[PDB]
Design an enzyme around this catalytic site. Sequence first.
Site, PDB file in Angstrom:
ATOM      1  N   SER A   1     -65.518  32.405  69.039  1.00  0.00           N
ATOM      2  CA  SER A   1     -64.647  32.669  70.153  1.00  0.00           C
ATOM      3  C   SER A   1     -63.722  31.362  69.983  1.00  0.00           C
ATOM      4  O   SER A   1     -62.869  31.233  68.924  1.00  0.00           O
ATOM      5  CB  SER A   1     -65.525  32.607  71.341  1.00  0.00           C
ATOM      6  OG  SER A   1     -64.355  33.106  72.436  1.00  0.00           O
TER       7      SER A   1
ATOM      8  N   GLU B   1     -65.403  43.558  72.359  1.00  0.00           N
ATOM      9  CA  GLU B   1     -64.986  42.021  72.633  1.00  0.00           C
ATOM     10  C   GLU B   1     -64.885  41.793  74.297  1.00  0.00           C
ATOM     11  O   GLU B   1     -65.394  40.888  74.785  1.00  0.00           O
ATOM     12  CB  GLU B   1     -63.888  41.660  71.991  1.00  0.00           C
ATOM     13  CG  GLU B   1     -64.170  41.477  70.297  1.00  0.00           C
ATOM     14  CD  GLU B   1     -65.138  40.150  70.033  1.00  0.00           C
ATOM     15  OE1 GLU B   1     -65.677  39.610  71.156  1.00  0.00           O
ATOM     16  OE2 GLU B   1     -65.403  39.859  68.974  1.00  0.00           O
TER      17      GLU B   1
ATOM     18  N   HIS C   1     -68.840  40.437  73.442  1.00  0.00           N
ATOM     19  CA  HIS C   1     -68.598  39.020  73.029  1.00  0.00           C
ATOM     20  C   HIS C   1     -69.634  38.397  73.129  1.00  0.00           C
ATOM     21  O   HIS C   1     -70.417  38.192  74.171  1.00  0.00           O
ATOM     22  CB  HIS C   1     -67.315  38.499  74.164  1.00  0.00           C
ATOM     23  CG  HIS C   1     -66.726  37.137  73.497  1.00  0.00           C
ATOM     24  ND1 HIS C   1     -65.931  37.232  72.440  1.00  0.00           N
ATOM     25  CD2 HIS C   1     -66.980  35.915  73.933  1.00  0.00           C
ATOM     26  CE1 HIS C   1     -65.427  35.867  72.382  1.00  0.00           C
ATOM     27  NE2 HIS C   1     -65.960  35.191  73.205  1.00  0.00           N
TER      28      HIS C   1
END
Length: 530
Positions: free
Chosen positions: A200, A332, A445
Site C-alpha cells: 500500500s 483491491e 487489499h
Amino acid sequence: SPPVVDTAQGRVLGKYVSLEGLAQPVAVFLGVPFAKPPLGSLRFAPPQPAEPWSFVKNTTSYPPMCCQDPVAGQMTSDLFTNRKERLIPEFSEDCLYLNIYTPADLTKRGRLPVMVWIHGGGLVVGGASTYDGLALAAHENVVVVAIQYRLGIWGFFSTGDEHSRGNWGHLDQVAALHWVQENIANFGGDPGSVTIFGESAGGESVSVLVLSPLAKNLFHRAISESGVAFTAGLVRKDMKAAAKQIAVLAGCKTTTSAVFVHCLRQKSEDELLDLTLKMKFFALDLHGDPRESHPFLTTVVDGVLLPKMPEEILAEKDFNTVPYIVGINKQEFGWLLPTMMGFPLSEGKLDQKTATSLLWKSYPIANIPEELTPVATDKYLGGTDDPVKKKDLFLDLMGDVVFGVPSVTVARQHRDAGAPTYMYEFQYRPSFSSDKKPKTVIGDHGDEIFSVFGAPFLRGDAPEEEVSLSKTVMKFWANFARSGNPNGEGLPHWPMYDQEEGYLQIGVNTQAAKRLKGEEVAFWNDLLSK
C-alpha cells in the site's frame, strides 16, 4: 544465552525465539534506533544520526509507533498483523526505530539476503511491530528488517520550499537503509543484497525509493505490493491547499513559510495529534467539495528525494533500475478500504447515479473530473441492471483506477528502462480475515500479507491449501531477494514482465497469464487523454 550485537552507535541485546515446526532459532531485536528522535526543532527536518550509547541497549520490547490517530492505528494493526498475540501499540514522536529478525548464526559472519519491510497505512497510520518477521526469516533463511518512518503531519508537512521541503518519512526510510548498510553485517545480513518491500503506502514508498537519487546503492531488489508512485495520487507537485487548511486549524500565521513552520514546531505532540484528527485523514469527505478534500498528506516533488514528478523520472530512465516485482490483488477495493474510508456501501446494493456520485467524491484518490465520471461508471456498470452486481463492479472500478492502472503503468516503464520486472495478481481469501468481511470478497487489499509473512505458522488454524500458499509466496519472495528472480525448484513458472506482459496469477491455482489489466489501462488513459 541472549544475543548481543555491535552497531556503530553501540551494543544491542535481543532475544532468541523459536518457531513451532522449525528447528531454526531466530534472534529478534526490537526497537533498534536508527536516528536521533525528531523532537522539537528536529520536527519537519531531515533525520539526524542517533547519538551513541554506552553499555548494552536493551532491544527486547516493541518500540512506539509514530504519532497517528490511535483508534485508526489500533484498527490497522489488528487488520494487518500476522501473529497470534494481539499488539496494543504505544505512540510517540520518538519513533525512528526498526525491528530485526535474523536466523543467522551470530558466531559466524553470515551473509544472508536482507528484506527491509516498509509498512502501509496511507502515510498516516501504521507501524513496524504489527509485522512479525519470524516465520519468513526461519522458513527462507533471510534477515527481515521492519522499519518505521514519520507519518502524517510529522512525516509530510510541506511549505513547498526550503523552509519545509517535505518528505520527512521518505528521508527516514532512506536513513534506515543507510543504517542497514553500515550495520546489518553484524546481524548476519549481506549489505550487498537488500530487498526493499512494502504494501500500500509502503509500496508507494518502495516505488518512490526506486525513483530517488538519494536511495542509489541502498538496495538491490524491490517489491511493491498494492502500491506504486501513481497510486491514489500519493505523489503531487505541491501541497498548497492542504497546508492552508493546516494553518487555519493550528492557528498559525502564513505570512511566510519560515514563520509557518516555526509556529508548527512550537506545538506540543497533543496539539499536533488534535490537528491530525481534525484533518480527517484516510476518510472520504461526503459533504464538502471533493476538490478541496485531502485525506492524505502526500509525497511531494521537493528537489531532493524527487527532483521532478515520477512521470518524468520514469520517462528519462535514470533511476535505481533494480529487479522489481510489482503486484496487485484481485479486489483491491473489495472491503477493507471502502469500510475504513467510510464509503456509504454497507447496503449490499448500489445504483448507477450513486456510483457516479461516489466516484466524484473519490476525486482525491481517483482523480477523475466531474464531467467524465458518468462515462467511467457507464463503462463498468452500464452492461447490467442488477444493483448487487453494480456494487461489485463499482468496487472493481475503484480498484482499477486507484491501484491496478497505476501499478501496470509503473511496471511498464520500469521494464522499458531495461530492468528485470515481474508482476502478480493475488487472488485468495485468508482465513485470518475479519468477521465483518463478506465471504465473497477474495483478494482484498492486504490479503497477500498473510502469505508473505507466514501467518499460517504463527496464528489461527489455517487449512493445508493456505499453509501451502504461504510457503509458495515466501519462497518466491526470498528467491527474488537471493537472485533478482523469483523462480526456483518446485514452484510454478513465473514469467518475466517483458513486451508480452506475462504475469503470475497467485492463488489456490497459481499459474501464468498475459497482459494484466491491458484493456483497463487502455480505457483509463484514453478517458484522461485531453
